[PDB]
């Protein structure tokens with residue numbers, strides 16, 4: 001490594017929380033120079049008909065992969081990036097001056113997170129992409145340094161991001177598990193096989209989604225549910241919290257003290273034993289009503305959010321998953337988003353979600369072992385994946401924790 005060694009992240013070479021550096025003042029502000037013939041632009045994902053959007057969609061479709069290609073649609077990208085509070089300058093493009101060919105992208109979105117006894121606005125950096133031909137032209141560190149600069153100028157000094165590769169020391173590692181829905185489609189596409197043991201017909205039967213015990217009262221969310229949903233999440237995070245009740249109701253607001261190395265030191269917290277954290281949520285996204293409205297909605301072939309209503313019009317449960325269309329043949333993959341099971345078991349809620357994914361033409365359903373999802377995927381028909389997702393936080397200390405301690409899902 002000739003870049004990551006110079007950033008405030010935990011290195012491959014503890015048991016406490018808080019900022020790595022409180023450097024409100026001493027960070028670079030001059031926009032970074034690009035190689036001759038390249039220029040930055042703010043990517044206009046606000047107008048779905050724009051040229052910026054076509055170029056971004058094309059760049060990502062052709063080049064965002066470590067075959068098969070994911071195919072983030074334009075509606076998906078607008079949902080995942082034009083979020084409440086988004087800055088125009090956090091959607092960063094690079095183009096060749098002569099041809100106007102988009103050859104790079106990086107994005108950040110603003111989120112609210114709780115980390116142990118602190119709460120803060122932070123950023124999520126995602127969709128880092130360099131045209132296949134310009135790789136090993138050391139362009140990615142520049143996109144990273146530039147998004148960093150644009151985030152710090154908003155007085156945000158931390159970030160969360162994921163990766164397949166191991167870079168520095170991640171605070172947790174998520175593992176994907178996979179539920180097969182459309183056997184025939186996955187078989188013909190070579191994504192799965194027929195166990196030499198059994199026949200195609202039995203394989204299909206083995207992977208059917210059991211629909212012989214159905215939970216009444218689930219329906220898609222609507223805008224007017226947003227306050228009930230906001231409270232539902234607050235109560236879920238209350239139940240699973242890793243701090244006392246008093247700390248939960250009096251979280252250290254880092255936005256208010258991040259301007260001062262004196263005051264910011266308030267955010268440091270030692271941990272007696274890492275096992276004290278066992279199976280509680282330590283870090284998660286926090287949603288206000290505006291956030292709920294945007295994220296927990298329903299957009300065909302992008303995001304599906306169902307709630308359970310009781311006979312008093314009170315929302316008691318929620319499942320949600322997003323959808324990414326892939327091409328090798330068109331394959332639609334659902335991903336588990338956020339799920340709250342209160343009046344049924346988590347397996348039962350997931351069963352209902354899996355049926356809804358099948359009804360939305362999804363061919364498989366992917367779930368990380370985050371939060372409590374291991375209650376679902378242990379001793380089930382889920383198959384463990386090989387894809388392992390490393391979670392990182394920039395400029396904060398988080399002990400290495402189990403994925404069940406993590407309530408953050410990236411797109």
Ligand SMILES: CCCCCCCCCCCCCC(=O)SCCNC(=O)CCNC(=O)[C@H](O)C(C)(C)COP(=O)(O)OP(=O)(O)OC[C@H]1O[C@@H](n2cnc3c(N)ncnc32)[C@H](O)[C@@H]1OP(=O)(O)O
Nearest residue numbers: 001002003004065126127128129130135136138139140157
């Ligand atoms: C306060 C705010 C702070 C905000 C900043 C928070 C940090 C954000 C971090 C970004 C979070 C990303 C979130 C997502 O989007 S996750 C998905 C990552 N993107 C892809 O998989 C798309 C397909 N791949 C590509 O487009 C390129 O290969 C990419 C762009 C990935 C690398 O480009 P390239 O292959 O042409 O190489 P280079 O010569 O230009 O540069 C080499 C340097 O780049 C480091 N590298 C390579 N890949 C990644 C990677 N996926 N994360 C972090 N670092 C990476 C590498 O260690 C090396 O550094 P070092 O070993 O010398 O030190």
